[PDB]
Write a protein that binds this DNA or RNA. Sequence first.
DNA 1: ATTGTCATGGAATTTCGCA
DNA 2: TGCGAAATTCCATGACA
DNA 3: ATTGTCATGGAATTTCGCA
DNA 4: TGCGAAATTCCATGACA
Lengths: 184, 184, 368, 368
Amino acid sequence: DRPQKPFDKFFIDYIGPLPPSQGYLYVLVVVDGMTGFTWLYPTKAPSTSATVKSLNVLTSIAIPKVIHSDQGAAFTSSTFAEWAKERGIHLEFSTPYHPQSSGKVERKNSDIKRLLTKLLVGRPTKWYDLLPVVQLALNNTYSPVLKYTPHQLLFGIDSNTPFANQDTLDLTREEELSLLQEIR
Amino acid sequence: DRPQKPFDKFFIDYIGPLPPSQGYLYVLVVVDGMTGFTWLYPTKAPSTSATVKSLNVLTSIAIPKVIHSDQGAAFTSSTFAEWAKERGIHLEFSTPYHPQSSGKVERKNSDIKRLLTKLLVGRPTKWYDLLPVVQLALNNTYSPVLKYTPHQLLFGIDSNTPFANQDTLDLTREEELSLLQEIR
Amino acid sequence: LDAELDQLLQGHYIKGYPKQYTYFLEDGKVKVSRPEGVKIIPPQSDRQKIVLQAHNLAHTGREATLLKIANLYWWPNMRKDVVKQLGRCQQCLITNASNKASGPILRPDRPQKPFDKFFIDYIGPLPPSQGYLYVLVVVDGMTGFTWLYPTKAPSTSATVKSLNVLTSIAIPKVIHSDQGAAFTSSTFAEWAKERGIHLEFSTPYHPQSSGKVERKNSDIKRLLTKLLVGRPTKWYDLLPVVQLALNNTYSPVLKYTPHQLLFGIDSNTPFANQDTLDLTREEELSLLQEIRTSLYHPSTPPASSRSWSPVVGQLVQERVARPASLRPRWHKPSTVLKVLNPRTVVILDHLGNNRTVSIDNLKPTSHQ
Amino acid sequence: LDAELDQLLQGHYIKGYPKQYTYFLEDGKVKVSRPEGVKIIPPQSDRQKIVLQAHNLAHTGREATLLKIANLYWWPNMRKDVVKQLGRCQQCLITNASNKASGPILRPDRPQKPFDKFFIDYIGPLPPSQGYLYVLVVVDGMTGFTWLYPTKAPSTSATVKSLNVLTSIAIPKVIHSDQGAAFTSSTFAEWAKERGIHLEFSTPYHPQSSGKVERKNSDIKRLLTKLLVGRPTKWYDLLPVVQLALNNTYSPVLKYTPHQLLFGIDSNTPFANQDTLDLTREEELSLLQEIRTSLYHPSTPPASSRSWSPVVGQLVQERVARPASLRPRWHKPSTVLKVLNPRTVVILDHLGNNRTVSIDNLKPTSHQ
DNA sequence: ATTGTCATGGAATTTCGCA
DNA sequence: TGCGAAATTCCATGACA
DNA sequence: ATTGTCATGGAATTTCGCA
DNA sequence: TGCGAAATTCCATGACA
Ligand SMILES: CC(C)N1C[C@H](C)n2c(c(O)c3c(=O)n(Cc4ccc(F)cc4)nc(N(C)S(C)(=O)=O)c32)C1=O
Ligand SMILES: CC(C)N1C[C@H](C)n2c(c(O)c3c(=O)n(Cc4ccc(F)cc4)nc(N(C)S(C)(=O)=O)c32)C1=O
Ligand SMILES: [Mg+2]
Ligand SMILES: [Mg+2]
Ligand SMILES: [Mg+2]
Ligand SMILES: [Mg+2]
Ligand SMILES: [Mg+2]
Ligand SMILES: [Mg+2]
Ligand SMILES: [N+]
Ligand SMILES: [N+]
Ligand SMILES: [Zn+2]
Ligand SMILES: [Zn+2]
């Protein structure tokens, strides 16, 4: 077997609904399996159409050999399957109700949700503008298991934005009682 | 004394009134003394103004050291004298009622009047268009006294329009009885 | 195809397939173990389609196309098959730039006499002056003597009015122009024929061909510029002044002014040359003929190391004149009928018309 | 003046007046009998006025001015007095063309890392497509990897929207641009400072300076052209395709694609290179660093035989950028403050501002 | 205060395949 | 240890408003 | 069936003035 | 038969839409 590489497998998934930001409601999450690099795209819906529109952007930069997802309707449509076939991408689905990634990806997806949650309190509506800096954080975050950040693993160089401030990522007692009010 | 040259002396004079041609009535006649070369300019009047306007064209091609004329009002005005002085041209007048040129010029001016008269009968109104071909005729007409045409003497080459048909220049019995009708 | 590749697998020798390498089957595909690594040998009947896919990714030339193919494949003489396709890609052929320079310019003989050849052209639109917008420029080929005429438009009727005034002085054998509307109209052709003047036209969009008058345009604009510094651009009244000024200016290489070459004596203008004051007009016109024949004449410069020269029957392409945005800069390939001279050709154009054309407006179609 | 010329007449010797010629009085004017003929020697106090009249006829340079004067006059060292005036003619100085070429170009070091330097520029207006008119082009200096963004206008707000999307991937140290309105706005400066990006600007009207992105523009338009042959110019939908196509195209001199220089491995695109399949990612990023440092680097070409080089305190003139019809092509003379490098200078401009400027947009003022 | 670039396809040179 | 031909490298040309 | 040109000002070369 | 400096000639540069 050959060693794992960037672009070998992209893990994709949706997060939402969220509070409207510039009329966007969802975030399409793409994580490279090998490097742990994350790309985010804001959508208006978790549809095949919005997935195609978004991945059209990403795949004009790099094309994965395999995309993996759960059995979201968006991903199991034959429109999405035509799209992947045109591009020579193999689609891979996890069995229903049992999502499988890798340790690395699972952890990354955890961070993303946790990071998003943290910053959308206090400003549940300003997230669209924040996506760029979320990505930079995620991608310049040190990997415990490997010695390197996704940036380093993708590009083979240090980054010009090192995020030395590995944050709390947890909710302060302010933010806790603030997120129980937006719901109530 | 030094031999006579082109541009040494221009002999100028007016011919008219004539029958309106494109609203022109006079012809300003310029003849180089040495070469016998002729330039013609149609004017609306024998004024200083029209003389200046016309000679402005000629003298943007070549400037004579001396202009000679009779004592026409047009030529004796101090406007015309300012003009000549600006351009460094000496003005020379023949004494009143006694016009003096040279054999060559006198003969040329005779030809011009004779030639004009000939072609303005039958078409007393089309002369404006004819000036170019009148000039070519006059300038490519052989000089009995010198071996050469004015063209040859001015440019030192043969012309591309040799006028081998040295015409009658006299009036036919048709043209005689036709010119006695335009008057009567 | 499958024939060749079968023989090859059982260790036979096929021409073009070096015997020193071990060729094998794997995944249902013939492979060879090459110093660069293991590459697939596609069947001949597959190869054109591979080259094309490779090429089409970005419409790449020889090397960049080859490098893509070489990632996955090997077969004998790949570049030959690469080049084969490049020569057949209409899109590449009509969009790409040339990389061969024209042969060195010709320096045609200076017309022998004043009035043998006029070069003419328009300058403009200039800023309005007295409601005039253009200038007709007329340059005598032998002398460089120049006539300037302001016009409201670069039109045949304005050209005709102007030349009627000029031709009063003399009639020229030939008038040379570019192919501007004013000069190619049949009204203009009548007017010329009427006077026994021959019209001679530059190859299209190649103003070098009218170089005598073009070069004079520069001088005209230059002088006008200097005169108008700090004033509004009222040039109409200056044309006469410019005309006279330029016609009486020395060309340091010739040591003569255009007026001197035309008349053999200065008129009454500032700093008039007095050297022939003691000669008769006849002795003067004699020295003039002598001066006229002994003027410096430049010779054709050295070829660039990568110039190309036109050959009868060769595929060449004409440059598109006023190409629209995102449209090819070259017309479809065409054929050289006659080689008028090393810098001018007649081509048959796929329509197919005869077109007389400058080599500068051509490229030789690549890959034959 | 009259002093010098009196001594001279009575056969005394004055420096500069060769004694072997006979100087005399005639018509109240000092004359000398020269091999060319008899010429007038004007008094020194007259000479400046003569040169000026000579020169002004057509605003002629050295030789043509001299030749006029020489028709009537002689005096010692005429050209010195000729040149003196040419150096003082504002009109000649700001209208005439240069006749000295710039020194040979610099070939700056390729930025060491991806993301060290971005070069950016707009292309357009293009024909409308989906109501878009322009393209923002972003080229990473080290890799040549490129990002394309369609915009309705070459505006700061469109640039900001675009770079926010791009900078999601990485933040560059420096962004280099020309001085287009979009890039010089203070809104853009804030945006850059906010992110610790340094803005670096080309000398004005010298797109060679942005040569990395400019050169890529060409490729972009070229590919778009080929793809659109025989179709209407609907380019908006093609931008992504072009981006990917170009980023994955080999540069035959480097033997790498921009994507390869950026990532060290091909993604899943046609004819993907498979050479590092057996290396670990770590071994792969190791070979990559090695590749990156050993890429071919061109060197500065030979000087032309008539190039000029800028010196501190020298009078130079800046080329006028968008000169109006019949207006000088050169600004008034100015002074070289600092020589930043052999091809770039800072000048003080008579106003006097400091301007950082390309040598290509300068000429050395003639006749000092 | 900043600075040309690089795809292209014939020609030139080097390397390969074989002896 | 040298040949003919194929592969590679060289590099002037031109176009990025 | 047509085809570059030539002012310009430093540098290079030649000629002049004098011995 | 040779020197220093002035005169002349050479010629790359660039612009004629
Ligand atoms: C429309 C008619 C036929 N016309 C068409 C062409 C445009 N043209 C003229 C014209 O007068 C001039 C120019 O003066 N110059 C400038 C020039 C450039 C180089 C050179 F060596 C000399 C001059 N270019 C021109 N062009 C031909 S270009 C090269 O722009 O296509 C033209 C026409 O009258
Ligand atoms: C208005 C803003 C400041 N701008 C001003 C200038 C016009 N410019 C751009 C710009 O993008 C381009 C170009 O792409 N090219 C084409 C080019 C020419 C030679 C070369 F080596 C590379 C490219 N020329 C340009 N010019 C500077 S020119 C030489 O016409 O003055 C410009 C600007 O954005
Ligand atoms: Mg899901
Ligand atoms: Mg009278
Ligand atoms: Mg024209
Ligand atoms: Mg023209
Ligand atoms: Mg720009
Ligand atoms: Mg640009
Ligand atoms: N010729
Ligand atoms: N550098
Ligand atoms: Zn192609
Ligand atoms: Zn001047």
